[PDB]
Amino acid sequence: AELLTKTLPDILTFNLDIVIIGINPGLMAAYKGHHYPGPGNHFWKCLFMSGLSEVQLNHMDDHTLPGKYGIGFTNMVERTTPGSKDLSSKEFREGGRILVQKLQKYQPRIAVFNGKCIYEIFSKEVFGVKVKNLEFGLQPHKIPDTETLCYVMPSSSARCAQFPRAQDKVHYYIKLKDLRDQLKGIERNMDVQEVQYTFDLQLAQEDAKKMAVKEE
């Protein structure tokens, strides 16, 4: 089949702690049939760097996340296509209905929005609210008629301009892990707690470029 007609099977089950939600399937993800295949994405690196996974995994391990990590995947819109930040209001709205339907069925503890962009779209087409001063992290609203929380993290795509490297985004994966543990009553080692991360944008871009040039 031609790439734009392909879809990406989501990975959902009951009793999940986290569901990673993006706008729609990326080109490489749809092509390979796995969620967030790098190197143009920082998801898997951040997943390990934040301690959400025990070892460094890759897109071919996505199927193991529900069972071993209580993590699943899906997207706002199932249709594959670049420029998805500007899809029609009607397509987003319909995708939102389907997404909320799945969340109300599986009831994951936290709906994790991969980037402010997708959460902004979700709020507009589902809540009917243009969010003002959207902050990263936990949001005050839950998925319609459920106890599922909404958590917003920086986009994992390498295209994210605000955060050039995986390490510039991992802070929120760490905060997500801390929240997750709290919900499960998992003993949190309060000896050390990361509370803030700031960096120099330009040096980060240059660093990201260099590492990208080094062929392993």
Partner: protein, 79 residues
């Protein structure tokens, strides 16, 4: 016990704030830092006002206080 906020600054000017317990071995801090930065524990050295931080040093032992800065350097040349 009591805790203090420490700022860990890297050579890329990244600055990472951590809330740390005064009586805990900084090994945890160094470990947390190395993992979140994606580098080996032996690839970095942590300094507090000229003093290299050992795994069994605690903020209280080093005389650290709120807002103190820890500087991190690589043990080897750029990646």
């Amino acid at each position: 016990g009591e805790y203090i906020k420490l700022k860990v600054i890297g050579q890329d000017s990244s600055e990472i704030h951590f809330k740390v317990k005064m009586t805990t071995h900084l090994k945890k801090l160094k470990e947390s830092y190395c993992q979140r930065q994606g580098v080996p524990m032996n690839s970095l050295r942590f300094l507090f006002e000229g003093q290299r931080i050992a795994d069994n040093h605690t903020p209280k032992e080093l005389g650290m206080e709120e807002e103190d800065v820890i500087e991190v350097y690589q043990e080897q040349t750029g990646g």
